[PDB]
Design a protein around this ligand. Sequence first.
Ligand SMILES: Nc1ncnc2c1c(I)cn2[C@@H]1O[C@H](CO)[C@@H](O)[C@H]1O
Length: 337
Amino acid sequence: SMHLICQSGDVLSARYEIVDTLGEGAFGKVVECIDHKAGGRHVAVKIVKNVDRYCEAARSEIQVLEHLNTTDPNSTFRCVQMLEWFEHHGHICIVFELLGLSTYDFIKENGFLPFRLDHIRKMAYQICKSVNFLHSNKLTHTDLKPENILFVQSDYTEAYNPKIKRDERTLINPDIKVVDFGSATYDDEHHSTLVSTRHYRAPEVILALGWSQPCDVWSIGCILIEYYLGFTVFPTHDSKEHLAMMERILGPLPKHMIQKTRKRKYFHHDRLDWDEHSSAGRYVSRACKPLKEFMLSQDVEHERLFDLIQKMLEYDPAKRITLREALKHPFFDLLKK
Ligand SMILES: Nc1ncnc2c1c(I)cn2[C@@H]1O[C@H](CO)[C@@H](O)[C@H]1O
């Protein structure tokens, strides 16, 4: 059991002393450690469950990272640096540079308040650039979400905010890196139709129409909205409900995608088989609404962000904006000189 080897004070590989837990996922956990063979430098160690599927994903992640960290040794494109890996009591352990809080945890610890728009702009730009780098190297991440975007330094300043009537944390440096390459898939590898359920899943994934780089762009759209609102606009883990939410926010799915899907169960006469008047249906109607109605201001920068988000949430992955195009969107003009 992981609990036997992941506690504060334990030593891994005769080297890494566990300080505390940084975070957890399906795979196991990530712990901060003091590296006694590198002068006491603190690092992050990802301790992977001794379970086939996660061992496999960990081996894949290692191969992806060897490739990315070799192609981009200075982390210009902001993928986390893997320092090494080892085994410990049958657990794969991957050692990474220590980063700050995930963008998820920062939001959580700031009372679910959104990020300020200028930070959203910088972070969005970096995410697009980082993931575009992956896209340039024939990779799709597939598991982009706020937990997998981390601040390089999550240090903040804190003031009372009269407008919200609560104390607010403001981030000092919004620079990020992307983590978790355990699902990342190369173009020449099999893109399994089977993908497991998230808030950040693209419609082509849910409908098993095949996926590739565009599914990442969808996820990034979901992320940006969450950064803007402080909460997710797809809070479900049921697929059909997810599709009903999409329809409420973005309009009906394209007929041609509905026609092509193997997932006939969701539909009836090429319309989503969804009772709006069920208790779940009434929840979807009242919680979800057309995308633009989530805007907190009509100011032009808000309108620019939402225009980009809308393009990232194009249903048809063949028509969805690419990250290469996203990087030229007007929302990013303020970052250029
Ligand atoms: N290198 C790192 N430095 C600091 N924290 C890290 C990492 C990595 I790799 C992951 N995490 C934390 O663990 C959570 C699940 O991966 C993430 O969501 C995050 O909270």
